[PDB]
Design a binder for these strands. Structure first.
Lengths: 116, 136, 43, 75, 177, 50
RNA sequence: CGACUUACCAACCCGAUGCAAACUGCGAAUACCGGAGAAUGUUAUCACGGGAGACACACGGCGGGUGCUAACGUCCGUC
RNA sequence: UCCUCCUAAAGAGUAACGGAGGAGCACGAAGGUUGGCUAAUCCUGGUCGGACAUCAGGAGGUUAGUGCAAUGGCAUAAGCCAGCUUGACUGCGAGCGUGACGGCGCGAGCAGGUGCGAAAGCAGGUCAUAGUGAUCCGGUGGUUCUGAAUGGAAGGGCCAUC
RNA sequence: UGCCUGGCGGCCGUAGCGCGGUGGUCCCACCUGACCCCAUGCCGAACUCAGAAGUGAAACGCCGUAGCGCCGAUGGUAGUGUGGGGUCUCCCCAUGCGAGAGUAGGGAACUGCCAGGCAA
């Protein structure tokens, strides 16, 4: 199962970040509408979220679910986090290879202020 | 001569015979021999009792043995000093607690059943009593 | 598809005795001559 | 041909639930991981559990496998 | 690829009408094919493995991989991790052209032909079979090879049972004697 | 105990060396690990020797 | 190349019955460790210093190994 | 002498010429990190091939495996595969466990300089528990520390190691 | 506020399996192609990129069903600390603690944060 394999892949990282006790930037990727979220160390609340599923961010990019979409979401999370106040975060692959859209989102985020 | 096959260990501790019997009810036949006393039965005693009943019933009915030795017992050779390791295994015994059902039987009249069990109990070292299958 | 590890998969036209001709990509080589095919056979 | 034995390794729980410990103190000595490290608890190379911070030690059961965890709260 | 269009043209409709499914994807469809060659005699002469792999590359469109023993068994004098066979799995587009070569040029060229078997089903919808000799495929010239070893074929589909798998294969004009 | 002990000598002029073990029967070639030399406080190549 | 029966041998499983110091999908009483509290006890506790003796133990109860669930036998745990 | 289980009486420890077995290693990778993967046993189809080679599907969920006997542990895998590598590093070390002692074990963290990763991070050998021998005497390399009138040297000391 | 959907958790079998039904407005999945990014110890299988035709088949979510797993009393029983007694290799009395298995029964979940669509 794709989901079961993915959860098994990301379990070690999630546990490592959980015991470390640090805010983590978690990204969920699908064939469309790449998501992104910021989670408190306790893991119970979401500091801020962004994605291409809402019209506020989906009204510019031609198509959601590409490199451009990842950069927009990656950038979008940036100023939101900077405005909120949190600066340092830990990136979570969530079992997605850090190659394409995931890398583009992270690259946009780190260059936008969320260094990690 | 009941005996296990390829037991895990050749020797085992003496242990104790405290407690109370578990198989206290007739489960296969209609009549059974219940153990009143406490002790151990060797393989030879079980065989002797079994032969006594089979002859008594004249190979009529069914016989169930509800006890297995599964416990080796050692014995030092004559003119041997204490120590120098555990003794060699000689015979196998089954620990019996009060209420244990030794033998079960079915397919014969109650009258013939009583004498058959009485003959067997005469060749056992523990007080025994005759019981009948209960309804629930 | 890995490179320079697979045999050449060029197209080649093959025809049999009963007049049926078809194009197939394989490793047969330069030319091929057949006598029977899926049809025109006592299957 | 018997008569051989090994010196006892004095394993077991050294600090029990609800008693304060200092950082670096050994909590449990074990061969495997009968208890898993929780919060402010580190695991040694020999699966020894030691306190990474000062506080009260507590035991709990967590996870889908109901495996036992040892944590420390700064109290 | 030509039969893939043929499959997409009316075979899907033929499957649709006969089973009158609710949807279109319910119809069984092939997803991959697998070629096996359990040579077994690697111990006697491991050098022949390379050429045994080579011919499979002749029939197939890609390089085979050599499989290793799952475990060591004393009855066969094989140790764990020792190559004792090769296999090939082909899917996507390349499977279709190979399926053509099997169904058009290979089956007719069977020595002492009697008819393709119809009981060779695993019980779930997957078909398997074997061949005596390599010359059935055109890629053997009878002079560059001197071995009698055969190979095994196996086509797997999304069928939930044998009845639709057999029906789907029948749509591909299989002999089934 | 076929495995025998060797000495790893720093490529630098310093006389510092490490000591380890190796099997000459299976791996007869020299050992060229890159280790830390505290006399010069740098990581340098260490060569096998007696 | 189809295929069939059985008065006869029997695997794996299902239902019931047991056994285990070196089996545990369960699990006490006590004991042990830590914390708080009252009373009681000639500080009964700990650390340091001076001086020792002792390191052949025995029987009884309880939990055992060994022996024959023999020994005023032998070897351990606790009082 | 050392290691594992039981005896051992639910903390630790606990004897017998009591009951069972092992060790005097191995590995420059079988170590470090990054990425990925998940067995045994059965059922059906299939050339040699056959109960037992390899292929496909299904039940199964670890009865597999874990370099070496046993116990405990291991899916975040400690099990299996691949890339890059030498942290199997130097000076320390709060605080603990264990011993009559000699001693043995665990260890966050600090400084220096490295490897893997985009990064958070991990790495002071190996899933852990056996694979080991005090002191004396002497050998090898470094270090003006000393060097018995002075300058050297011999010989000692210190450090690494046999 | 409600029916829904996705992510991150709490909690961990009353939460897990089996059978039946139900879902495409969004979301999710499958799905087309892959010259380029990326990968196959062979394979667009898996991973990754460019897409959205088609579809709810499979998977996933929800509902129903006890067919299993699971939870589970009260009472009794076993064992047991302390103090006594006996026809003492085993038991009994007073007091304290009190199982395991089984039985009646329960049971096919609950809950926090964020984001999106519909109706409000």
């Amino acid at each position: 199962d794709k989901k079961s394999a993915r959860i098994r892949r990301a379990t070690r990282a999630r546990r490592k970040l959980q015991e470390l006790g640090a805010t983590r930037l978690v990204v969920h990727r699908t064939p469309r509408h790449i998501y992104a979220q910021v989670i408190a160390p306790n893991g119970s609340e979401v500091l801020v979220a962004a994605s291409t599923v809402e019209k506020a961010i989906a009204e510019q990019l031609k198509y959601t679910g590409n490199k451009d979409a990842a950069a927009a979401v990656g950038k979008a999370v940036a100023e939101r986090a900077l405005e909120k106040g949190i600066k340092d975060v830990s990136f979570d692959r969530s079992g997605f290879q850090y190659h394409g859209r995931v890398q583009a989102l992270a690259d946009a985020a780190r260059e936008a202020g969320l260094q990690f | 001569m009941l005996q296990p096959k390829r037991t895990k260990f050749r020797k085992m501790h003496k242990g104790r015979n405290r407690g109370l019997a578990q198989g206290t009810d007739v489960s296969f036949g209609s009549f059974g021999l219940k153990a009143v006393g406490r002790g151990r039965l060797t393989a030879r005693q079980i065989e002797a009792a079994r032969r006594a009943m089979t002859r008594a019933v004249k190979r009529q009915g069914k016989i169930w043995i509800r006890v297995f030795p599964d416990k080796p017992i050692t014995e030092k050779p004559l003119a041997v000093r204490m120590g120098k390791g555990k003794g060699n295994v000689e015979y196998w015994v089954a620990l019996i607690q009060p209420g244990k059902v030794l033998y079960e039987m079915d397919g014969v009249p109650e009258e013939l059943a009583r004498e058959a069990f009485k003959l067997a109990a005469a060749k056992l070292p523990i007080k025994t009593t005759f019981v009948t299958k209960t309804v629930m | 598809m890995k490179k320079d590890i697979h045999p050449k998969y060029e197209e080649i036209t093959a025809s049999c005795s009963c007049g049926n001709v078809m194009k197939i990509r394989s490793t047969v080589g330069h030319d091929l001559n057949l006598d029977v095919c899926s049809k025109c056979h006592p299957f | 041909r018997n008569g051989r034995d090994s010196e006892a390794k004095r394993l077991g729980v050294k600090r029990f639930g609800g008693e304060s410990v200092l950082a670096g103190s050994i909590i449990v000595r074990q061969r495997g991981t009968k208890f898993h490290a929780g919060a402010n608890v580190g695991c040694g190379r020999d699966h020894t559990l030691f306190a990474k911070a000062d506080g009260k030690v507590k035991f709990e059961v967590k996870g889908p496998k109901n495996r036992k965890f040892i944590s420390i709260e700064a109290e | 690829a030509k039969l893939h269009d043929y499959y997409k043209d009316e075979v899907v409709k033929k499957l649709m009408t006969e089973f009158n499914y609710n949807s279109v994807m319910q119809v069984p469809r092939v997803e991959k094919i697998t070629l096996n060659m359990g040579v077994g005699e690697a111990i006697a002469d491991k050098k022949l493995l390379d050429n045994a792999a080579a011919d499979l590359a002749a029939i197939s469109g890609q390089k085979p991989l050599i499989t290793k023993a799952r475990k060591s068994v004393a009855g066969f004098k094989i140790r764990q991790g020792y190559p004792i066979g090769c296999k090939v799995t082909l899917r996507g587009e390349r499977m279709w052209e190979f399926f053509e070569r099997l169904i058009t040029i290979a089956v007719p060229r069977i020595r002492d032909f009697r008819g393709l078997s119809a009981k060779s089903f695993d019980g779930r919808g997957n078909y398997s079979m074997g061949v005596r000799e390599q010359i059935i495929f055109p890629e053997i010239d009878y002079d560059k090879v001197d071995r009698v070893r055969g190979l095994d074929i196996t086509i797997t589909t999304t069928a939930k049972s044998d009845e639709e798998g057999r029906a789907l294969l029948a749509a591909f004009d299989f002999p089934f004697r | 105990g076929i495995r025998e002990k060797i000495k790893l000598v720093s490529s630098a002029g310093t006389g510092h060396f490490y000591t380890t073990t190796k099997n000459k029967r299976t791996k007869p070639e020299k050992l060229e690990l890159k280790k830390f030399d505290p006399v010069v406080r740098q990581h340098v190549i260490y060569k096998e020797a007696k």
